[model samples]
Target: PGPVLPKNALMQLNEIKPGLQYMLLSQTGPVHAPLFVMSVEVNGQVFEGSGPTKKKAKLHAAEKALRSFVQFP
Candidate 1:
């Protein structure tokens, strides 16, 4: 079996900060290859993520939000 894994970006953000807001900013591209843009506002700035699916986009946005907190290795 795989090693124990930590929570995903979206779940981590939700637990770390209550009332984390997510929104679908836009959807584009063709039916077969759709593009979704998801947004999340933390503190005062906004973060966005684009992907083929809403769930993926949301996770990306969550990752961006978390990255804003830390910048280097």
Candidate 2:
């Protein structure tokens, strides 16, 4: 893999704003199938994301955060 999803987004944000932090919100679903919810605060705004795994959720949140800066390009 060239760059790991949210990590790339995180890197971009890091260069722009280094105070962002990721937080775990909730973990639901059964043991066989689990769902994770993640949250992040950027510039006084809170963004949330969910996925089957924490990393995925983090990437989701990161994407949302990046959207405030980038639309598609």
Candidate 3:
């Protein structure tokens, strides 16, 4: 595994260590503009991200989680 989409959450996790656990923490904001909060568990550590989109949260969390080990693509 290597860097394809460095900004991609799952892609980074897979290359960083593999088998990362992810979760949806919360979704806030309004009905029309709901925000997202997500978390990822990697190497026994958990990282959280909050944004306007689930995809954004997931990617942010993944990027944050891998910083301890690698540059994350």
Candidate 4:
């Protein structure tokens, strides 16, 4: 199974560190599996998307969109 975090939590994490890393975890019965998912540098900004789409490829794409709106250090 997979778990998702709330946007507020995500934003809070980003606020703490722009270059934050994320992980994707999975579990099967008694065994647990985890993978390095993505690294995002949140520069106190937001992103725009095509609402939501099935064709969405990577989180980096969305991050890039957000970066465009950011005022970075």
- Candidate 1 local lDDT, residue 9: 75
Best by TM-score: 1
Candidate 4 residue-wise lDDT, 10-73, digit = tens:
4444554446433222222323532222333344443322212211212543444345545431
Q: Per-residue CA lDDT of candidate 2, range 1-73, in tens?
A: 2244456766676666667678998889777988897887777877787879988887677667767656643
**19 in model 1: Cα distance from truth in Å?**
2.2
**Which pairs, if any, clash in model 2?**
none
Clashes (N, CA, C under 3 Å) per candidate:
0, 0, 0, 1
Q: Residue by residue across 1-73, what tens digits does model 3's lDDT show?
A: 5555444556757776777777997788887888998888887878887778887887787777887557543
Give each model a TM-score. 0.73, 0.68, 0.70, 0.27
lDDT of 1 by residue, 1-73 (tens): 1122124676667666656578997889787899998887877777888879888887788777877755622
The per-residue C-alpha lDDT of model 3 at residue 44 equals 82
Better of 2 and 4 by TM-score: 2
**Model 1 worst lDDT window (10 residues):** 1-10
Q: Which pairs of residues have clashing backbones in candidate 1? A: none
Runs in model 1 lying further than 4 Å from the true structure: 1-7
- Ranking under lDDT, best-scoring first? 3, 1, 2, 4
Judged by lDDT against the true structure, how good is candidate 4? 0.35
